[PDB]
Design a protein around this nucleic acid. Sequence first.
RNA 1: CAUC
Length: 150
Amino acid sequence: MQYKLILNGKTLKGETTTEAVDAATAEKVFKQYANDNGVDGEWTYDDATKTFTVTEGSHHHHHHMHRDSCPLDCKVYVGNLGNNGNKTELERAFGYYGPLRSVWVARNPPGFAFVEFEDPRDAADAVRELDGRTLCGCRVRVELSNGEKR
RNA sequence: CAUC
């Protein structure tokens, strides 16, 4: 019986078919043809239209409509926290919403500090649920850090 | 939004 395959990639994309028994032969035929175009992403199958797919993430190229919202932008600010310069509380508070990359706190009876996350969405979620309330024992103004010029 |  014949089966289909789609090679959804950034630049090289396409589709083909083959005579097989089922996935037990189609899943060891398309593996060659896909690598001959050069795709080798998410190996998929549809059990109602009998059509494989391989949505690319292996030919080492991708871009879309993003720039000033990347892993570089993840720096954050926190202040009016309460008298604490030990980082541990705010560090687990930050990394709780999602993994950090760096944390800083000052030297003179502080209640003010700085932070950097790994995903800019970890910083965004943290900023959205750490602000204007309380964390250590104060009112926590929490913002993205303005401390850059590219 | 710096006390590094």
